[PDB]
Amino acid sequence: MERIKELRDLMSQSRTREILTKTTVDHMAIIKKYTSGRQEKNPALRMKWMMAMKYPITADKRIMEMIPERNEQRQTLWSKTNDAGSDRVMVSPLAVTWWNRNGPTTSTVHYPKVYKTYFEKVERLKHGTFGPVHFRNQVKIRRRVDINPGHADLSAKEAQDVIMEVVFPNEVGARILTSESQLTITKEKKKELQDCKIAPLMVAYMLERELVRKTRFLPVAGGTSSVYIEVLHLTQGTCWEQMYTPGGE
């Protein structure tokens, strides 16, 4: 409904009609990145300089009707001015704080499921047991390890198709799933992700983070395992070793 009405509104204009009709789907990858904004050269300096301004942040137009124009202390939260090259509006950081105290609350029960990797990390740390510290000469060998506890040994292609099946079932295309592991993973993810309002792109990114194995060259000294490379910063030192056992297998 809203989609087709917006498409009609776009087609009403001449320039938008020309853009829509004369651009193919392949050319979209190019025209969507078309921008006059240069990638920031000194983000730290720019951030320090911008935080002294009234409206350094950008927000969607909906904010206009979702938070008041001014504070209880007559502090303006957003300005009508549009961000350059877009329909977003300039807002002050106060608005964010306002949303964090007076914004519309929503149920957050899929978040631990969607961000399963981070909460697995925190649960592993919570149930870990520490041992003594031993002061001795530490020998570190630069070895290739995998920083990904719980990955399902899926490469780019297979993980991407599983994510496509889970998050965008109708856009999977010609590919089909054969390995029983992929089928069970897809079924479990679909069951657990049912009725999830988190952004589909974020869900896909988290699934990729959880399913695809990553590797890195690191100066390891002790056990070479994902759960141990996860706390390498905590366990190994220049002259000390901290005995530790993660609370997750």
Partner 1 sequence: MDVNPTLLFLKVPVQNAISTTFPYTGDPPYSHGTGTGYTMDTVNRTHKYSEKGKWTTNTETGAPQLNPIDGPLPEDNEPSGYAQTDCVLEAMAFLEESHPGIFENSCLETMEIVQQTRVDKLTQGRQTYDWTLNRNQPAATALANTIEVFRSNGLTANESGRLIDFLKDVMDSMDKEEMEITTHGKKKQRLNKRSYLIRALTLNTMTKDAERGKLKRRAIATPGMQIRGFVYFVEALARSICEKLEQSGLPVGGNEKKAKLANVVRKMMTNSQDTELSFTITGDNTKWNENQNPRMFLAMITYITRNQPEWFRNVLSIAPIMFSNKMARLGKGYMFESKSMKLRTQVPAEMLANIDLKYFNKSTREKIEKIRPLLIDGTASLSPGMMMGMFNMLSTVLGVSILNLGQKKYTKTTYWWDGLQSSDDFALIVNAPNHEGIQAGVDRFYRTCKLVGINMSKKKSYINRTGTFEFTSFFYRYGFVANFSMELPSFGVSGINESADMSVGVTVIKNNMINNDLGPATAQMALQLFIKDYRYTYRCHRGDTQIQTRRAFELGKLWEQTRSKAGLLVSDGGPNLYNIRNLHIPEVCLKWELMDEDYQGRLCNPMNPFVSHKEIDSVNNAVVMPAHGPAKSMEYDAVATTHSWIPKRNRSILNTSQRGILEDEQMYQKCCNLFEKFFPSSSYRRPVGISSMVEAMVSRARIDARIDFESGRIKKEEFAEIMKICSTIEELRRQ
Partner 2 sequence: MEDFVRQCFNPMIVELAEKAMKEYGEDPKIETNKFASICTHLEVCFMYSDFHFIDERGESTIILKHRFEIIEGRDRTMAWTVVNSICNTTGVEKPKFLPDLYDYKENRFIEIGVTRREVHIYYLEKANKIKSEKTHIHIFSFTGEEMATKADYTLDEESRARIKTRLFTIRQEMASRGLWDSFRQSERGEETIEERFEITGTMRRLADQSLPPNFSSLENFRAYVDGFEPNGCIEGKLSQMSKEVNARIEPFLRTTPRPLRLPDGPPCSQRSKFLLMDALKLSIEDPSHEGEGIPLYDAIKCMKTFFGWKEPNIIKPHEKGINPNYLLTWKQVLAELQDIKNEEKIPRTKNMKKTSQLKWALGENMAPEKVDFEDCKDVNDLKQYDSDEPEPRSLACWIQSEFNKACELTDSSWVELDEIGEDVAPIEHIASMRRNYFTAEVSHCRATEYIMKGVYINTALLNASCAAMDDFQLIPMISKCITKEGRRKTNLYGFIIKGRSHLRNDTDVVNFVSMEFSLTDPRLEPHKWEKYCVLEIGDMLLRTAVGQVSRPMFLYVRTNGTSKIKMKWGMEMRRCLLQSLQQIESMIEAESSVKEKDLTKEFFENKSETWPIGESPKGVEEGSIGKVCRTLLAKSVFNSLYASPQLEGFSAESRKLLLIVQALRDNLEPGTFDLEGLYEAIEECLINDPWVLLNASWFNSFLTHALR
Question: Which stretches of the chain bind RNA, using CB under 7 A?
Answer: 36-41, 46, 49-50, 81
Smaller CB separation from partner 1, 30 or 180: 30
Q: What one-character DSSP code corresponds to residue 82?
A: E
Instruction: Residue 55: name the closest of 33, 78, 34 by CA.
Output: 78
User: 3-state SS string over 44-64?
Assistant: HHHHHHHCCCCCCEEECCCHH
Smaller CB separation from RNA, 49 or 168: 49
> 198-237 b/e with 16+ CB inside 10 Å = b?
eeeeebbebbebbbbeeeeebebbbeeebbbbbbbeebbe
Selected from 9, 11, 23, 49, the binder of partner 2 by CB under 8 A is: 49
Residue 218, contacted partner among partner 1, partner 2, RNA, none, CB below 5-8 A by kind: partner 1
Smaller CB separation from RNA, 43 or 132: 43
Selected from 80, 104, 135, 249, the binder of partner 2 by CB under 8 A is: 135
CA 79 to chain centroid, in Å, comes to: 28
Q: Tell me: does residue 202 bind partner 2 (CB under 8 A).
A: no
Q: Tell me: does residue 244 bind partner 2 (CB under 8 A).
A: yes
User: Strand 216-220 to strand 240-245: parallel, antiparallel, or no bridges (unpaired)?
Assistant: unpaired
Q: What one-character DSSP code corresponds to residue 39?
A: P
Q: How far is the CB of 83 from RNA (least distance, A)?
A: 10
Residue 249, contacted partner among partner 2, RNA, partner 1, none, CB below 5-8 A by kind: none
- Which spans of this chain sit near partner 2 (rule: CB under 8 A)? 25, 42, 44-45, 48-49, 52-53, 130-133, 135-138, 169-174, 176, 234, 237-240, 242, 244
